[PDB]
C-alpha cells in the first residue's frame, strides 16, 4: 500500500545523525565520515613551478627579440641557482620551481633550439605557465569537509598535509536477533517445521561491510520474557536494533505487543515486489527495524531501506540513492502494476559494447540464487506491467554487499 | 614502449594461486575464498512443500465431484500429522510440507467454501502446486565451488544447509614499505626538498580493502644496510613485497643494485599514463613490485597492475578486469597517441537519463584530487588523439577502493 520512497522519507526524516567522535591515525580511517573539517597547514603547491617542459623567461627579455641562451636550468630537486644574466633564458620542466624573477613559461613545442640560443617566435603573456604557491589549496583552506567519508582518494591527501591523526564520528552500533522456535543453529539436525537461521547472518555480514558495530544477540527463545529481555539489552547497549526474522511486522501475537509496551512503532505494508511488511519504530534509547521471515524479502527490505537508514546516521553527507541507469532487456520480464519490483538480472556487454539485462531466472522468493547469479536489480516501475524484449528498464548495479 | 596488456601477462602468467587454506566460521567469511567445493549435505527443499497458499487433496476425494470438508491445516513452522478421512482436505500455507498422501495442492482462488466443506471450482492435476524436495539444491550437489569469493549472496546460503565453518584460501600478505631521505612523516618539518610520504599510505590502505594482511615496515632510510634489512625481513614474511616509492624503478643507484641481488626482477617502461616505470619480478621467497614515487603514478599503477596480481594469487577464480562501459563525453579531452590513458572522469546521468562522462579537470600528475572528484576512468586508446564533446569513448567505474 505504501510506497518505498515515502517510507524511506518518513524514516530518514526523524533520524538525527551521531556526532559522538573519535581521532584515530589515518591508516585506520577507511570509510569513517570525517567529525570536523580539514584545514590546510601548508600551500599546494609550496613554490611557484612550471607547468610545463620549456623556457623560464622575463617579458623584457622576449620583447628585445634576440634568440636567448640557456644560462642554466631547474628541475624537479633542484631550483635553478646562481645569477641570471639579462638576455638569457632558464631551461626548465614540469614542476621545477621557477626562477626568482621569472615572468612566464615557454614550451618547448614554441620554440627553435638553436646553438647559440632559443628562438621565441609565439607571444608570451605574463604569468603563463606558472603554476603559483597555494593555487590547489590554500594554507587555511577546508580541504574535506565535516560530513566526508574517507576513502584512498581523500585520506592520501591529507597525508600529504603532515597531518597524522583525523577526527571522525563514533560508529553506529547495531544490535541483531531473531526469534521463533523453528530457528535452528548450524550442526543440529532440523526437528519439526524447522529450519536453519540464515537471515541474521545476512544481516550481520552485510553490517559489517558497512562498518557498522554489531551486537549480535542470538536466537532468543521463543518467550515474551527472554525477548523483553533481549530488546532491553538490545536498546541500553545499540543506536539501532534489528530483528532479522521472527519478530511482527504486523502479525499480532506475543512479540507485537512487547513491540508495542517497549517503543512507538509503525508497521509499513510497502508497495515493493519481493517483501512488503516491514516494523520501524524509536525504543527508549535506538531505533528499531523489524524485518519479514523471508530470506528474500528481508536482504531486499535491509538493502533499500536499513542501508540508506545507517548511512544517514553514520554522519555522512553523501546526498543521494545507490546509482541506477536506463538499459535495454535482453530477456522478457513478468511484471504486476501495483508493486515496484526489484527483480535480480545480469548487467553486461553485447556483441555491439552496449549494456544490457539479462534475468537471472524465476523471481519468487522461495530461493536465495539470484543474489549469487545476479550483479544488479532491475527496478520495475510500480505501475508498469509486463515488459518485452528490447525495452527501457531501470537498473541499480549491485554494491558490495552482494560483490 | 611496452603495453598494458602484455605486462599484466607476463606478470600473471608467472604466478601461482596460494592453496594453504583455514577453516573459519561463516560469519568470519566476507571476500575470503573457498578453499574446497561446498557440497550440499541435504536437499532443499528438505520436504515435499505447498507453492501456494490453498488446500492439499487426493485425486480420489477430488473425484467425487463433493464439497469436502476441513480436516486440519498444514503451516510452515507446524505441519499437520493428524488424521486425514476420506472425504476431506487439509488446509495448506506456501513452504507448508504437503502431507502423507498428497498428490496435489490447489490455491483458494480455484476454490470456494460451503457450509459443508471445500468445493473445487477447477481441474486438479498430479504434482501441481508441491515444490519436489531437493528440485533446487541435491545432496550431494556442488553448490559453491572451490576459488569463489563469498559474499552476502553465497555466504547465507551456505547457512542454509546448516554448515558452521568452511575452509578458505589463507589472506595473502603483502609487505610494503617506502624509501627515501626525502619522505617524510608527519608530526615533522619538510627539510630541503623534504615531502610528506603518501604513497604508503594510499597502498596500505587499498591492499587493507582487498582482504590482504598488510605488514608495512615504513620508512627506510637512505642506506643499503637498512634496505637490504627491510627485503630480507619482507620476502622471508610475506607473498608479495611492494616498495610504495624510493626504490629504483630503472634509475642505477645502490637500491637498484640490492634488487638485482636478492631476485631477478624486470625494470619495464610502460605504454600508459599517468605513470610508466614499473618493476616486477622474483626475489627468494616472493613477489616483488616496485612503484614508481608519483602520488598519481603509483595510484594508478597499484590499481591497473598489483591490484589483479593480487587476485590471481588469493585463490579467486573470478576471471576477468572490472567492468568497462561504451559512454559518450560531455568533455573535451586532450590525449597525446601513443599511450594508454588513465584519465579520471565524472560518470553521471543526462537529463534523458543516459549515461556520460565529464572530466575531473586538470589531468596532470601533479594534484590527486581527481579520484576523489571522479568516479570513473576515461580508458583512453593508446593510439587515440584528442576527444570533442560527443565522441564514444571507454569507461571504467571506480571500484570501492575510491568510494
Same mark, same amino acid.
Given at each position: 500500500?505504501?510506497?518505498?520512497?515515502?517510507?524511506?522519507?518518513?524514516?530518514?526524516?526523524?533520524?538525527?545523525?551521531?556526532?559522538?567522535?573519535?581521532?584515530?591515525?589515518?591508516?585506520?580511517?577507511?570509510?569513517?565520515?570525517?567529525?570536523?573539517?580539514?584545514?590546510?597547514?601548508?600551500?599546494?603547491?609550496?613554490?611557484?613551478?612550471?607547468?610545463?617542459?620549456?623556457?623560464?623567461?622575463?617579458?623584457?627579455?622576449?620583447?628585445?627579440?634576440?634568440?636567448?641562451?640557456?644560462?642554466?636550468?631547474?628541475?624537479?630537486?633542484?631550483?635553478?641557482?646562481?645569477?641570471?644574466?639579462?638576455?638569457?633564458?632558464?631551461?626548465?620542466?614540469?614542476?621545477?620551481?621557477?626562477?626568482?624573477?621569472?615572468?612566464?613559461?615557454?614550451?618547448?613545442?614554441?620554440?627553435?633550439?638553436?646553438?647559440?640560443?632559443?628562438?621565441?617566435?609565439?607571444?608570451?603573456?605574463?604569468?603563463?605557465?606558472?603554476?603559483?604557491?597555494?593555487?590547489?589549496?590554500?594554507?587555511?583552506?577546508?580541504?574535506?569537509?565535516?560530513?566526508?567519508?574517507?576513502?584512498?582518494?581523500?585520506?592520501?591527501?591529507?597525508?600529504?598535509?603532515?597531518?597524522?591523526?583525523?577526527?571522525?564520528?563514533?560508529?553506529?552500533?547495531?544490535?541483531?536477533?531473531?526469534?521463533?522456535?523453528?530457528?535452528?543453529?548450524?550442526?543440529?539436525?532440523?526437528?519439526?517445521?524447522?529450519?536453519?537461521?540464515?537471515?541474521?547472518?545476512?544481516?550481520?555480514?552485510?553490517?559489517?561491510?558497512?562498518?557498522?558495530?554489531?551486537?549480535?544477540?542470538?536466537?532468543?527463545?521463543?518467550?515474551?520474557?527472554? $525477548?523483553?529481555?533481549? #530488546? +532491553?539489552?538490545?536498546?541500553?547497549?545499540?543506536?539501532? !536494533?534489528?530483528?532479522?526474522?521472527? *519478530?511482527? &511486522?504486523?502479525?499480532?501475537?506475543?512479540?507485537?505487543?512487547?513491540?508495542?509496551?517497549?517503543?512507538?512503532?509503525?508497521?509499513?505494508?510497502?508497495?515493493?515486489?519481493?517483501?512488503?511488511?516491514?516494523?520501524?519504530?524509536?525504543?527508549?534509547?535506538?531505533?528499531?527495524?523489524?524485518?519479514?521471515?523471508?530470506?528474500?524479502?528481508?536482504?531486499?527490505?535491509?538493502?533499500?531501506?536499513?542501508?540508506?537508514?545507517?548511512?544517514?546516521?553514520?554522519?555522512?553527507?553523501?546526498?543521494?540513492?545507490?546509482?541506477?541507469?536506463?538499459?535495454?532487456?535482453?530477456?522478457?520480464?513478468?511484471?504486476?502494476?501495483?508493486?515496484?519490483?526489484?527483480?535480480?538480472?545480469?548487467?553486461?556487454?553485447?556483441?555491439?559494447?552496449?549494456?544490457?539485462?539479462?534475468?537471472?531466472?524465476?523471481?519468487?522468493?522461495?530461493?536465495?540464487?539470484?543474489?549469487? $547469479?545476479?550483479?544488479? #536489480? +532491475?527496478?520495475?516501475?510500480?505501475?508498469?506491467?509486463? !515488459?518485452?524484449?528490447?525495452?527501457? *528498464?531501470? &537498473?541499480?548495479?549491485?554494491?558490495?554487499?552482494?560483490?
Amino acid at each position: 500500500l505504501m510506497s518505498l520512497d515515502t517510507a524511506l522519507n518518513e524514516m530518514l526524516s526523524r533520524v538525527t545523525p551521531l556526532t559522538a567522535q573519535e581521532t584515530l591515525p589515518l591508516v585506520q580511517c577507511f570509510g569513517r565520515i570525517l567529525a570536523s573539517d580539514v584545514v590546510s597547514p601548508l600551500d599546494v603547491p609550496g613554490f611557484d613551478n612550471s607547468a610545463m617542459d620549456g623556457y623560464a623567461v622575463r617579458l623584457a627579455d622576449i620583447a628585445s627579440g634576440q634568440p636567448l641562451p640557456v644560462a642554466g636550468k631547474s628541475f624537479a630537486g633542484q631550483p635553478y641557482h646562481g645569477e641570471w644574466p639579462a638576455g638569457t633564458c632558464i631551461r626548465i620542466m614540469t614542476g621545477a620551481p621557477v626562477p626568482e624573477g621569472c615572468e612566464a613559461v615557454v614550451m618547448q613545442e614554441q620554440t627553435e633550439q638553436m646553438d647559440n640560443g632559443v628562438r621565441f617566435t609565439a607571444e608570451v603573456r605574463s604569468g603563463q605557465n606558472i603554476r603559483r604557491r597555494g593555487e590547489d589549496i590554500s594554507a587555511g583552506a577546508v580541504v574535506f569537509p565535516a560530513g566526508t567519508r574517507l576513502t584512498t582518494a581523500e585520506l592520501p591527501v591529507i597525508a600529504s598535509l603532515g597531518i597524522a591523526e583525523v577526527p571522525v564520528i563514533r560508529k553506529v552500533r547495531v544490535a541483531l536477533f531473531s526469534t521463533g522456535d523453528e530457528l535452528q543453529l548450524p550442526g543440529q539436525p532440523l526437528g519439526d517445521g524447522q529450519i536453519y537461521d540464515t537471515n541474521r547472518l545476512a544481516v550481520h555480514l552485510m553490517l559489517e561491510q558497512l562498518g557498522c558495530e554489531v551486537i549480535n544477540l542470538g536466537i532468543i527463545r521463543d518467550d515474551p520474557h527472554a $525477548l523483553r529481555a533481549a #530488546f +532491553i539489552e538490545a536498546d541500553s547497549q545499540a543506536d539501532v !536494533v534489528i530483528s532479522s526474522g521472527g *519478530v511482527s &511486522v504486523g502479525e499480532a501475537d506475543y512479540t507485537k505487543t512487547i513491540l508495542e509496551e517497549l517503543g512507538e512503532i509503525a508497521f509499513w505494508k510497502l508497495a515493493i515486489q519481493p517483501g512488503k511488511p516491514f516494523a520501524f519504530g524509536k525504543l527508549s534509547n535506538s531505533w528499531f527495524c523489524g524485518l519479514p521471515g523471508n530470506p528474500v524479502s528481508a536482504t531486499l527490505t535491509f538493502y533499500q531501506l536499513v542501508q540508506p537508514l545507517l548511512a544517514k546516521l553514520s554522519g555522512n553527507t553523501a546526498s543521494g540513492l545507490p546509482a541506477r541507469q536506463r538499459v535495454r532487456t535482453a530477456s522478457r520480464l513478468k511484471k504486476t502494476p501495483g508493486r515496484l519490483d526489484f527483480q535480480r538480472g545480469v548487467l553486461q556487454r553485447n556483441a555491439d559494447g552496449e549494456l544490457e539485462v539479462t534475468t537471472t531466472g524465476h523471481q519468487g522468493s522461495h530461493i536465495f540464487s539470484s543474489f549469487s $547469479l545476479g550483479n544488479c #536489480f +532491475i527496478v520495475l516501475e510500480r505501475d508498469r506491467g509486463n !515488459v518485452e524484449v528490447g525495452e527501457w *528498464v531501470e &537498473v541499480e548495479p549491485f554494491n558490495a554487499l552482494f560483490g
